Design a binder for this molecule. Structure first.
Ligand SMILES: OC[C@H]1O[C@H](O)[C@@H](O)[C@@H](O)[C@@H]1O
Lengths: 237, 229
């Protein structure tokens, strides 16, 4: 299809179009990407991801078209301790993507340790929310980063972690300008913006899958996806 | 998801979210449900169907919600014969639906002979365009339409159809038009909750028995959103 869109105002436990990987699962109408105990508390050494089953047509060589898309979502992080790790990320990757071996902790379940910074060995675009808890490639402060085939963000902006508070995020890609814009805000109006120019055609295959990934190494916290809407349409360029 | 939409203004041969069953395949940016030879002419004894990959959340028991959906599509039928058959149908069925053994010809690849008229043995809502007088029929768990209206078969002309379901009135409305303004309408009240499971798949089916014709799906757009009834 040239156009595709779907919306999850909440996440009921009766799911049919979500691909669950690692420890990801539904609890209390939300997606718990990282493992939680019976008390609903976060645990260490856990990784989880989800993908929408339908494949998205990102670009079409044949017609020289590239999709215009936007993903809107909300998440919250919680922990008994004052801070947590490691972070959550929205990502776009090849349809058959699976959790790489040894991609826990700071790798957010997105990259393999041996090729984490090798742009030629990866095909992925991600918007990460790093809670910088525990000191090496990205800035030494919590931030929102845009990753293009590397765990080392090509662009970042300072960010603030607030326990238990939902962050509303809007990610958009405009094929005529090639700008991938990210806007995140807390209910009180605190806003965070970061954008980057990138030609998705040279980074990802024509058909891709979209979803989220999160991980906790030694330090932990829950990475709870609360809502998610996505729309995409191929446009002539 | 509570809401889902997709649109195929055309059907390029590079598809990833379509489930092809029977002889259905893409040819010339269109879906050819029934088999065609090398020259592109229709042949006898052929059945084909396609379903969209992602399951549609039709209704939800917990929240007591039911989906408001719209399916807009266009197709054309061509046949050198004076009596092309058998027809094409838009249908909604359980996720694991497959072509029933012996469902060719008049059964349109939708029902099995033994239970084609046994409502209790089927779970499917379909809107058929039968050409073997020609008519538009609304099927609910049976090949025996709950109602039909007269229709005209125009060889090689595209018919634009809009099928909608309003959970508030439980009305399933069908509107079909030819490019000259010729209009056909038929409506039926039905509670989809009592007919289909909460999650379903949507697609099209077509077949030709001894008499034949091409069944070409040219475009298709679908949208669905759960609402409070
Ligand atoms: O094609 C016309 C006709 O051919 C055969 O007689 C059977 O397959 C029927 O079901 C079908 O209606």
């Amino acid at each position: 299809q040239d156009s595709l869109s779907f919306g999850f105002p909440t996440f009921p436990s009766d799911q049919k179009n979500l691909i669950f990987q690692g420890d990801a699962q539904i609890k209390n109408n939300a997606v718990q990407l990282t493992k939680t105990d019976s008390n609903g508390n976060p645990v260490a050494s856990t990784v989880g991801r989800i993908l929408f089953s339908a494949q998205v047509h990102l670009w079409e060589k044949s017609s020289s078209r590239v999709a215009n898309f936007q993903s809107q979502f909300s998440f919250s992080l919680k922990s008994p301790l004052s801070n947590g790790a490691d972070g959550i990320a929205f990502f776009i990757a090849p349809p058959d993507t699976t959790i790489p071996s040894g991609s826990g902790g700071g790798l957010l379940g997105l990259f393999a340790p041996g090729t984490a910074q090798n742009t030629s060995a990866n095909q992925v675009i991600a918007v990460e929310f790093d809670t910088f808890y525990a000191q090496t490639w990205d800035p030494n402060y919590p931030h929102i980063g845009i990753d293009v085939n590397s765990i080392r963000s090509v662009k970042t902006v300072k960010w603030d972690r607030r326990d238990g508070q939902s962050l509303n995020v809007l990610v958009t890609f405009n094929p005529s300008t090639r700008n991938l814009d990210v806007v995140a805000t807390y209910s009180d109006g605190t806003r965070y913006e970061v954008s980057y120019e990138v030609d998705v055609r040279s980074v990802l295959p024509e058909w891709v899958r979209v979803g989220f990934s999160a991980a906790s190494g030694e330090q932990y916290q829950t990475h709870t996806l609360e809502s998610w809407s996505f729309t995409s349409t191929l446009l002539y360029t």
